[PDB]
Amino acid sequence: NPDAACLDCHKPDTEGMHGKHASVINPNNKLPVTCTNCHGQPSPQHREGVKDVMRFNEPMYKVGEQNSVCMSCHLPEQLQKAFWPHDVHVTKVACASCHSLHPQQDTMQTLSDKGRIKICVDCHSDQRTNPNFNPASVPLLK
Numbered sequence: 001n002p003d004a005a006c007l008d009c010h011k012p013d014t015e016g017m018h019g020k021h022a023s024v025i026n027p028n029n030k031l032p033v034t035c036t037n038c039h040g041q042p043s044p045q046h047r048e049g050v051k052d053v054m055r056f057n058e059p060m061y062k063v064g065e066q067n068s069v070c071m072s073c074h075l076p077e078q079l080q081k082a083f084w085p086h087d088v089h090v091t092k093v094a095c096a097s098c099h100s101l102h103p104q105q106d107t108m109q110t111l112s113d114k115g116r117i118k119i120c121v122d123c124h125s126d127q128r129t130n131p132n133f134n135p136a137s138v139p140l141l142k
């Protein structure tokens with residue numbers, strides 16, 4: 001129900017949440033995860049493109065602003081146990097430069113051992129050769 005408001009304008013397939021987050025409970029309130037739990041709240045000026053809702057892997061907001069939303073639910077201690085490189089990136093690159101949360105599957109969860117090293121090379125190399133590199137908005141892995 002809460003998400004119905006957003007989906008009055010936004011496309012229910014591509015702008016609908018169809019990844020793992022579609023089926024999980026918000027640990028903070030024990031209710032299903034909703035759009036505002038990640039994006040916050042539209043203002044009356046929403047259609048004009050203003051700093052109302054959070055935007056992930058785009059240049060509007062700083063890495064820290066984007067990533068901190070994730071940490072309203074996730075625990076950095078647990079991210080370390082899942083995959084070591086998390087800690088060094090929490091303040092340094094947008095979480096959604098790697099993860100894709102809206103599609104039916106998140107490509108990070110299915111990478112080969114080889115692929116899970118190639119992402120490091122690809123992005124760190126780009127940082128060395130791309131004068132326009134922006135850690136808030138990285139299209140490379142997409």
Ligand code: HEC
Nearest residue numbers: 005006008009035036039041042046047048049053054055
């Ligand atoms: C029309 C009445 C809207 C409803 C209701 C909601 N959204 Fe919206 N959204 C709308 C427009 C016309 C735009 C483009 C604005 C611009 O920047 O030019 C947006 C944008 C967003 C975004 C940013 C998309 C991106 O580029 O990353 C997000 C994340 C977003 N809207 C979310 C969102 C949520 C969570 C809503 C319900 C609480 C919601 N929108 C309602 C139009 C409309």
Ligand code: HEC
Nearest residue numbers: 020024025026027033037038069070072073095099106109
């Ligand atoms: C609560 C409102 C959440 C916020 C905000 C974010 N996440 Fe989340 N996430 C949440 C839950 C309850 C779960 C399930 C854990 C489990 O029991 O399995 C998850 C899961 C993920 C995953 C795994 C996805 C997959 O396809 O396997 C990822 C990669 C993930 N979360 C990342 C993530 C990011 C980057 C966030 C901010 C943009 C974020 N989550 C916010 C709950 C919540």
Ligand code: HEC
Nearest residue numbers: 067070074079082083085089090093094095098108109116
């Ligand atoms: C690429 C360098 C990544 C960045 C940037 C972020 N994450 Fe990540 N994450 C990445 C991989 C390759 C994996 C899978 C590890 C595996 O088991 O195969 C993950 C996993 C997660 C998970 C799920 C953990 C679990 O218990 O299964 C979560 C919840 C998650 N990642 C969240 C997350 C957040 C919040 C990030 C920004 C602070 C973030 N990730 C960045 C790769 C990468």
Ligand code: HEC
Nearest residue numbers: 003006010015016017021034035038056096099100101102
């Ligand atoms: C975290 C668990 C999220 C929830 C729940 C919702 N959104 Fe989302 N959104 C999130 C991320 C990490 C991204 C970047 C792209 C990706 O899939 O990882 C987005 C993106 C959007 C956008 C713009 C992206 C695009 O379609 O080009 C919009 C307009 C958007 N999100 C809206 C939206 C709606 C309506 C939601 C409820 C159905 C919703 N988001 C939930 C993180 C998360």
Ligand code: HEC
Nearest residue numbers: 085088089092093097098116117119120123124127135138
């Ligand atoms: C962009 C999508 C990135 C991906 C993929 C990976 N990293 Fe990265 N990392 C990124 C930035 C913008 C930075 C800061 C600038 C820099 O290059 O140093 C980093 C930093 C690191 C660090 C520094 C740790 C520290 O000194 O505090 C390490 C150790 C690191 N990155 C490792 C790493 C690994 C193992 C990755 C794949 C599993 C990886 N990075 C991917 C951005 C991105």
